Amino acid sequence: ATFDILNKCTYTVWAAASPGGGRRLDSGQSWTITVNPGTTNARIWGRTSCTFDANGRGKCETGDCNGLLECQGYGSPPNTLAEFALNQPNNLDYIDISLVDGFNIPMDFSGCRGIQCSVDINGQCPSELKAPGGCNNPCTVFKTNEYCCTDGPGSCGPTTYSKFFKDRCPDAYSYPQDDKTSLFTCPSGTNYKVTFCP
């Protein structure tokens, strides 16, 4: 599948992908990548307030991936995520926006349907969850089963903190087991667009 990733934010977003790497996107810029069928565990995000040297090493305020421009692994929360797994059984791609590793930049993820989390989550973030440049999920910050769902299927459910996210972005995962209303599929062969600040 192809992914067009577009920055419509008024500020530079250093886009990142696992797998795929990373690119500086100033306002209005785009980066198109191919992710092969069968890839699972994949994600596209944006990073704010980065600084990189001529070799691409440095540090981002949000979403930092081991201090590289061209990521080779996941970023540090808080980071809004476009998650996907391609060509799964019955020729299905499974897509979602997740807030389980936090929020940093508003996002639209579109394929056979549009998913969008665009409200001002940073401006409204509870003080328990605030981070520089974003809003953490309570699971990242408070490590208990109530928010992290480690104790098995059905052992957790929505909390006051996850409802903060879900009330604002009903279609994105707000806690780890938030699948019924956050996990979507498209037919394999669909191509995708991820847009920052839609």
Numbering used by the authors: 25 to 222
Original authors' sentences:
Despite these low concentrations, proteins have a great technological relevance in winemaking as some of them, the grape pathogenesis-related (PR) proteins, can aggregate to form a visible haze. Among the grape PR-proteins, the thaumatin-like proteins (TLPs) and chitinases can undergo changes in structural integrity, particularly under certain conditions such as when wines are exposed to elevated temperatures during storage or transportation. In this paper the crystal structure and some physico-chemical parameters relevant for the haze formation mechanism of three isoforms of TLPs isolated from grape juice were determined. Plant TLPs generally have three domains and a cleft located between domains I and II.
Despite sharing the same sequence, the two VVTL1 isoforms, I and H2 exhibited differences in their chromatographic behavior, a feature that allowed their separation and that also indicated that they possess some differences in physical properties. Although similar, distinctly different conditions were required to obtain crystals of the two proteins. The crystals of H2 were much smaller than those of I, hence diffraction data for these crystals were collected on the micro-crystallography beamline (MX2). Data were obtained up to 1.5∶Å, however there was a noticeable decrease in the quality of the last 60 images collected (out of 240), likely due to radiation damage, obliging us to cut the spot recognition to 2.5 σ, thus limiting the resolution to 1.65∶Å. Differences were observed in loops between helixes α4 and α5 (loop A), between α5 and β13 (loop B) between β7 and β8 (loop C), and between β9 and β10 (loop D). These differences relate to alternate conformations of the loops between the two structures, rather than differences in the lengths of the loops.
